[PDB]
Amino acid sequence: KEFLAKAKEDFLKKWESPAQNTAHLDQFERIRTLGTGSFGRVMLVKHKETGNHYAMKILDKQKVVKLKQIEHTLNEKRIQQAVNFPFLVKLEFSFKDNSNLYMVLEYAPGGEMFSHLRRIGRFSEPHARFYAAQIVLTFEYLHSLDLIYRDLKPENLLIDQQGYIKVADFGFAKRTWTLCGTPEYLAPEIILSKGYNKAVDWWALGVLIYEMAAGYPPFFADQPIQIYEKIVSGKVRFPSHFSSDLKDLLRNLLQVDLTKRFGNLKNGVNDIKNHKWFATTDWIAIYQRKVEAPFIPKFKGPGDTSNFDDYEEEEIRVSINEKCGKEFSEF
Numbered sequence: 665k666e667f668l669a670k671a672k673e674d675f676l677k678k679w680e681s682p683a684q685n686t687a688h689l690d691q692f693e694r695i696r697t698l699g700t701g702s703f704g705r706v707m708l709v710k711h712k713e714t715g716n717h718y719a720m721k722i723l724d725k726q727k728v729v730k731l732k733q734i735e736h737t738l739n740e741k742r743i744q745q746a747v748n749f750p751f752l753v754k755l756e757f758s759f760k761d762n763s764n765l766y767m768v769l770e771y772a773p774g775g776e777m778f779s780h781l782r783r784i785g786r787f788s789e790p791h792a793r794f795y796a797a798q799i800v801l802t803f804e805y806l807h808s809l810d811l812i813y814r815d816l817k818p819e820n821l822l823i824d825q826q827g828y829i830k831v832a833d834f835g836f837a838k839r840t841w842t843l844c845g846t847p848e849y850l851a852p853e854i855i856l857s858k859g860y861n862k863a864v865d866w867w868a869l870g871v872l873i874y875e876m877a878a879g880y881p882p883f884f885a886d887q888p889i890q891i892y893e894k895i896v897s898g899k900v901r902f903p904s905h906f907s908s909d910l911k912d913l914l915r916n917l918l919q920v921d922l923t924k925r926f927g928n929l930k931n932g933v934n935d936i937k938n939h940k941w942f943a944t945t946d947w948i949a950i951y952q953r954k955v956e957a958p959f960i961p962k963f964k965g966p967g968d969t970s971n972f973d974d975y976e977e978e979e980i981r982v983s984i985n986e987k988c989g990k991e992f993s994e995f
């Protein structure tokens with residue numbers, strides 16, 4: 665708890681006295697889209713002076729307001745510039761014009777983890793274990809800031825050139841969009857509009873590990889309603905190739921009973937770290953990035969993007985009238 669005790673202090677220092685790294689939008693050349701979302705997209709950009717590459721998130725200000733995500737966006741930004749953790753995406757710069765918010769992020773050239781997963785079918789248990797370790801640490805870190813990841817979106821788990829995970833989200837403090845739309849990853853307590861705490865993240869961890877090891881999520885159906893029924897049921901078919909160690913962990917993680925769910929017990933996350941499945945895991949070496957990654961992305965070019973999918977390229981139009989000024993004044 666040495667690396668996290670201080671990185672909690674560092675968060676508060678940076679929170680309260682933010683840096684003002686200065687670039688201008690005009691310095692970045694838009695190249696191609698790395699991903700799309702509800703209220704924007706992430707462009708790969710090249711710095712016109714250095715030739716260095718970044719991932720620029722472009723949010724339409726109006727669409728953020730029309731979907732009531734202002735507070736979340738402002739918060740997400742402030743959290744992100746304040747955190748320094750090895751498996752969280754750094755914010756480099758941020759700007760705004762009339763139409764858009766712009767957030768220049770550190771580029772993770774290895775693409776989304778789940779495109780490597782579809783490509784190879786399923787991860788081996790060491791391979792899955794390697795990634796899960798980073799997530800555990802990331803979740804432990806986020807928890808020490810009273811942040812909760814809540815909804816796992818595995819499209820948001822990126823891979824860097826060293827083959828380590830970069831997580832793109834920072835959770836929430838304290839949307840039927842998410843419930844109805846992305847159902848496979850919801851914890852039971854969220855489906856049944858009960859309370860939820862840090863323990864939903866350990867459910868998410870369970871789903872993630874299962875999907876990595878299996879190649880598909882543990883609760884799947886055609887209509888979302890059936891999925892909900894499965895999640896709350898507390899019943900999961902394990903593939904036959906799952907070790908009994910893995911099966912055991914997943915029963916404890918995918919526990920519907922909050923009070924018995926691993927991570928949420930007396931010893932907290934140490935239940936998880938000291939599980940037989942993680943016996944071979946050097947937690948310090950993972951944090952310090954000294955474990956050799958099982959997959960290292962192939963770097964064909966300087967701004968090579970073949971590790972991300974293709975997307976249609978909208979024109980980034982900018983109004984000559986400032987939109988949503990007061991709303992994003994503090995952004």
Ligand SMILES: [NH3+]C[C@@](O)(c1ccc(Cl)cc1)c1ccc(-c2cn[nH]c2)cc1
Nearest residue numbers: 699700701704705706719770771772819
């Ligand atoms: N998978 C998440 C999304 O695709 C994304 C796309 C649009 C929006 Cl509004 C939010 C998130 C994404 C893609 C790439 C990156 C990225 C690449 N390098 N560094 C960050 C981050 C998020």
Ligand code: NA
Nearest residue numbers: 990991993994
């Ligand atoms: Na404001």
